[PDB]
Ligand binder design. Sequence first.
Ligand SMILES: CC(=O)N[C@@H]1[C@@H](O)[C@H](O)[C@@H](CO)O[C@@H]1O
Ligand SMILES: CC(=O)N[C@@H]1[C@@H](O)[C@H](O)[C@@H](CO)O[C@@H]1O
Ligand SMILES: CC(=O)N[C@@H]1[C@@H](O)[C@H](O)[C@@H](CO)O[C@H]1O
Ligand SMILES: CC(=O)N[C@@H]1[C@@H](O)[C@H](O)[C@@H](CO)O[C@H]1O
Ligand SMILES: [Ca+2]
Ligand SMILES: [Ca+2]
Ligand SMILES: [Ca+2]
Ligand SMILES: [Ca+2]
Ligand SMILES: [Ca+2]
Ligand SMILES: [Ca+2]
Ligand SMILES: [Cl-]
Ligand SMILES: [Cl-]
Lengths: 779, 779
Amino acid sequence: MKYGYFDNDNREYVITRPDVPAPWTNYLGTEKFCTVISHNAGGYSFYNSPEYNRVTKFRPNATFDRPGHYVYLRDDDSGDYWSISWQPVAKSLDEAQYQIRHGLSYSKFQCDYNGIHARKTLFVPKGEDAEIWDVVIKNTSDQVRTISAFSFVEFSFSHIQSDNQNHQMSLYSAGTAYRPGLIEYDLYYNTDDFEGFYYLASTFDPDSYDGQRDRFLGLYRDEANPLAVEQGRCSNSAQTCYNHCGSLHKQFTLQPGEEIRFAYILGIGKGNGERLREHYQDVANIDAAFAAIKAHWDERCAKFQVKSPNQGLDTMINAWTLYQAETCVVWSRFASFIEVGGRTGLGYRDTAQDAISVPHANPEMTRKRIVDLLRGQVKAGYGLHLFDPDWFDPIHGIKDTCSDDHLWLIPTICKYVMETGETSFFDQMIPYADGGEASVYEHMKAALDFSAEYVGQTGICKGLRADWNDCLNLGGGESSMVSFLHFWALQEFIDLAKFLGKDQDVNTYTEMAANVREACETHLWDDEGGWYIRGLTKNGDKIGTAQQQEGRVHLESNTLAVLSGLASQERGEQAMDAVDEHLFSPYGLHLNAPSFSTPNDDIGFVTRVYQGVKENGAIFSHPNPWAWVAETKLGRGDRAMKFYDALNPYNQNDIIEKRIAEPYSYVQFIMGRDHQDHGRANHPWLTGTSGWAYFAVTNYILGVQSGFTGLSVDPCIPSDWPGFEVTRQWRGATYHIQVENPDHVSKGVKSITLNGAPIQGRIPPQAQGSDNQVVVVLG
Amino acid sequence: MKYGYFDNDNREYVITRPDVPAPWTNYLGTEKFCTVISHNAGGYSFYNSPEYNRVTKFRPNATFDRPGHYVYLRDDDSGDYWSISWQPVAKSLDEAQYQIRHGLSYSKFQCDYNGIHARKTLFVPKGEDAEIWDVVIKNTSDQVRTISAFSFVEFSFSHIQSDNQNHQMSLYSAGTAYRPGLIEYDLYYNTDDFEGFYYLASTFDPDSYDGQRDRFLGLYRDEANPLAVEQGRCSNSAQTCYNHCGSLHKQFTLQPGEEIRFAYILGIGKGNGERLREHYQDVANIDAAFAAIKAHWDERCAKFQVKSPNQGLDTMINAWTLYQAETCVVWSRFASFIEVGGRTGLGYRDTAQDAISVPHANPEMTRKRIVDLLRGQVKAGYGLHLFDPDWFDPIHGIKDTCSDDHLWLIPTICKYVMETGETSFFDQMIPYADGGEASVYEHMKAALDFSAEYVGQTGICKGLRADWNDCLNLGGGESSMVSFLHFWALQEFIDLAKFLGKDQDVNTYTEMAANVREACETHLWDDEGGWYIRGLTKNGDKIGTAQQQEGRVHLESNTLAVLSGLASQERGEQAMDAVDEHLFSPYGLHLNAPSFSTPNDDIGFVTRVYQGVKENGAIFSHPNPWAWVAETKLGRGDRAMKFYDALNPYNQNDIIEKRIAEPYSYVQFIMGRDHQDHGRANHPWLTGTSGWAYFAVTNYILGVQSGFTGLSVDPCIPSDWPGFEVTRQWRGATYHIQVENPDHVSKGVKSITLNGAPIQGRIPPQAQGSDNQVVVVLG
Ligand SMILES: CC(=O)N[C@@H]1[C@@H](O)[C@H](O)[C@@H](CO)O[C@@H]1O
Ligand SMILES: CC(=O)N[C@@H]1[C@@H](O)[C@H](O)[C@@H](CO)O[C@@H]1O
Ligand SMILES: CC(=O)N[C@@H]1[C@@H](O)[C@H](O)[C@@H](CO)O[C@H]1O
Ligand SMILES: CC(=O)N[C@@H]1[C@@H](O)[C@H](O)[C@@H](CO)O[C@H]1O
Ligand SMILES: [Ca+2]
Ligand SMILES: [Ca+2]
Ligand SMILES: [Ca+2]
Ligand SMILES: [Ca+2]
Ligand SMILES: [Ca+2]
Ligand SMILES: [Ca+2]
Ligand SMILES: [Cl-]
Ligand SMILES: [Cl-]
């Protein structure tokens, strides 16, 4: 079963029927004002901080996703009414035809019902902290029609906790006032004239309005049947206290075939509403704003485009996955339909990894996030697991420290400089979260040294509070995952030190890496099973061996052993063969097998989690891309693509009855084989799987990698691929790459020509604005 | 407009139409399991801790109060369905007749619709941690009817925060399993077999069941139209993860006039569901449990009953206000439809005051709360503003300390001993919250000494974080309210010291009281306005003077000046005349006038609050009873009764269009004259107004007071009252008091006879079980 399809030409996902088994969302905004909106217009907006500056309310985890940003239409001759989005009125699907087009930073809602065609485009324009509701109403019937339009949003008390509880205070913390075409919402206790005021404006001069939720909706009614809409007019309510809304109404008379256009604007700050309602009265200004949003992503998408034999890969890499990855970098991970309160700010390992994915498209935000992370690192070398970057914009103990957090930043910083060429970044002085300062370079060394310090007697990194797996809590125990990550970070740093001419550091960290490899190869390999163990408990018991009944094969240890470059080709192939044989499923790779069932606090909370769920035996998406990278390093492109195709949301467009979640978005996890709902995807959008998938495909499968001295092209693809093409923008120059595979191999470059001339090795960075033809022949 | 009436004979409030402008709630439970239920069966249950052991979910502050504890009925011949409570199905009120009877610790729901009579009684039986749903269905039509019944509750993830957010974790934290007539809900991460399991059972053997919320309700449907109910059968769902519910269904065939009875049971703990569903199959056990709940309150009500010329007073004192006050003592203040998360445990000043109200009816719980408060006091003498008594069941700094908290405990402890005669309580050793221990007596002295230490250069108590008024934040500034409270506490302690023969302490605290009175009479009286000021800022500027434009007359300072006994009769009368002239309104006494409008942090947050709202110029109920007491001390009974009648919810039974809130419950505050909604009552049930109102009427208007050596009767009533009668149980003996007012005075006892013999002064405590005739003649 399917509910829509991908429109490649318009870079939009088209939902043809709104009765999807779950809300399929999209993100509006690219700067500070953000809206998480569903295909049923449910959702909410916030400014900068989802926790402290929510703009409109949201009642989560319910059968309906309300409230939202709704436009109700009413036939004033019959009294019939419906919404442009299917919900909340939910007019029969046998009578009304709905369509939703989710695009990059905008969503188009359409409804054709009983002679009236209506369209509503919701998007947050660049340069403003507001959301435009571009509405078009057309009379397609053969008679004159009189249609009234009503808007609705329920204003938030701003702090999520105040919307959910402590109403003894929040119910008396705000008020509404009305001015022509503008409902002004005042957060009475917020003295800031910008952040302390919200508004809902209309480009038309209203016939009626409502600022009080209880008056617009009415007693014993909700968003599905507002009293104001049913009766055909608002009550012109506005006062201090209780719950507030933004409802503006206007009646229109339409001749047959006639259409009208107007807009509603939801925004923040005094003065802006009056200004924007006037500005957008000239629809050309709305079209210009929309064009700017299209340009924003056209510019980003153009920097990396691929044409290959795999349509699913092309569709996702050329738009959707780039989009999802950058959304994570810009908006972090705490504002979705799943993350709706509590945690806020930046997750250290999350943003550290996300930031490695799109420096080619958004170097400015990538740099900003990297600086945020460096400011969030303590002198000891570790990172603050969860923090608000605004805290350090010009601290927990070791007990709350996760062992992997800080290490992820090394490869990311190196990649940022490789991509931008901003070598001076390493000399920038950045303060530590707990006092003092150091250059970016020294911050990196502090991280590498920390992991060398916190090891066990055999040289394996301690797991501490938790490693990448939040449910693997070893403390004094040791993590294979962390040691492999340490090795990867060390390899990256060594290359940097060589490039910078830091001979002393090259020797120091080459020696450190050598010790890590020796320790891992000696202690972490299980020669009976043929794979790498997950780690060891504080008591020295190995976790993940061939003789255990639970949790024998783990995805993190085996994939990272290869991704880091630590494992030999021989052990790498066998370990990954174990991954394929025991963890692969048509929906992707399971995190571990068999699932844990016996509580064991020497291992972690994972042993107390349902089988096939979350960290315990489910298909946790994030590490899947690590397997793809591992396979490319082993030179097995067909294996890598098998894994890619299985997890690619695009290929599950017609199995929604099982998947449930958006076919254009990677999710946190899919129920594993041990759970009856095996196949059901959970938590779309804000997962690091997106950035890693993008990074893995672009840098390893397609094999395009920026470097300190040049651009490398070393693909690992399915042997049956005749070749592929990639357009890559790097440091202001364009590289038109054509890969040919006449002998049908998977990996191995026979020759590379730059503008007709054969070259050896990397492609040196060419002049700004230059266009270069790169032909790579495999063999 | 009215929506119901008081049924004095059955001690119930009868709601005749369910479309009340707000949810009118009741509290089920008297031990550990509690349910906050509305007249539309909306609401939730929790065990001991509302914050960490919520049993069923609640989506607060919305147009509908859902979810709840619902029973859906369906005519299987037509497919028509409705709920016993009006909502959530909301069958037309022109077709169905609904009635709700809220009683003491039970609620009766009734629905008569199209030939079917249905009744549902919800109550938490003593001795069990569960809620019984006693259902009776009767076919009143002239034909055979086939009716199916379905239950519904949405199980909570237990921690309120987990229901509201962090679903990335909570959605996978529980599961359901089914056994005959029992849906077992497992909080997977809670290892306790009792607290970690909930259930919904039926006395009947089900035809179908549903443990998954999404299957019972269905896609794009909610509690108003569950798919299971519409189709006439559940899907027999049960699994781990996602949202869970407790739905059990059974079809019944009823001959004309035939009726059936069965029950649903919502509860906690493994093993209990299977046991109780069997136990209640014998309806006699349900009736016995209900009889125990009736006995519980009959015993309590009988200890103080009044018969006077004022029906509203009698109705409330003989049942409703006693009920509300004890509900506060037992369940604290953090579980209502307003308090739904965040704060939990005990508020120091709140429980300290509440505990003075019902020691005659529930001495055990009163003692328990007093011990909780003593354990929550630090060596310095002050109390922890908000704490969980379970923490100290065998700490903030001075910056978070409120200046009044600890003082309220003195009069309360003295009253407890006067009431019970447990003089040995003073010698009990109780540990301080921050280490060390001291006798109850010494704990009290530590509190009194603290307030003598923290004073300004003129001898007035510092306001610190805040005094009784949470929005009056003076810090180094001084509070008139605190000094008056200190004087009251000192007077109470001095009497105790005298009684115990502690001569040294008598002299010490008599001297301390003398200094407080001199300082207050010299510095706090405004001789231009004729009242007591509210306090002084840290800079020495008086707050509440005749020359100021905002906040001239305050209720707290003027009432407490008299209640404490500090003010002279002359100043007391004039100050209270200012209260009457400037603060009285038909809805009660305003807290201050004029309202504040200019932000002034030297005074407090009250200057930043909307006018006529909350602490800024609204009718804050809590201090109103203080005015009643003040008037009785001045001997003006008519004035006291005028204030009582104005605030008495009972008298507002037919002005619901303005009041909105329950006419049987005192509320936190009523919108003041400065707000357009003047008259609207907010936050019923959990307000200290109830305990204070009960204490004020019983001890001062009716004038019945227990003492260390005897019972006192010194009433202050309206001069036109011919007299009144009171039945008082004290220390195991009954006192049948008859007050006669032949000369029509307001206060002043001419004679008192005990069993026919004239006596002078207090009535000595008589023998256990004795019945005594007390005749008091005023004059
Ligand atoms: C105006 C306002 O919101 N006042 C409330 C006050 O009534 C309440 O007692 C306190 C509890 O912490 O919070 C706020 O101060
Ligand atoms: C099983 C489970 O609930 N796991 C989650 C984990 O996925 C998440 O990353 C972490 C965040 O603090 O909380 C829990 O550990
Ligand atoms: C935002 C967040 O806390 N994401 C975590 C991620 O850091 C962790 O690596 C992974 C595995 O446990 O689970 C995700 O939920
Ligand atoms: C439970 C609670 O915090 N109740 C407070 C009470 O202590 C305070 O005396 C009063 C006046 O500010 O306001 C109530 O909301
Ligand atoms: Ca037409
Ligand atoms: Ca404001
Ligand atoms: Ca160019
Ligand atoms: Ca009949
Ligand atoms: Ca359990
Ligand atoms: Ca007796
Ligand atoms: Cl994730
Ligand atoms: Cl209150």
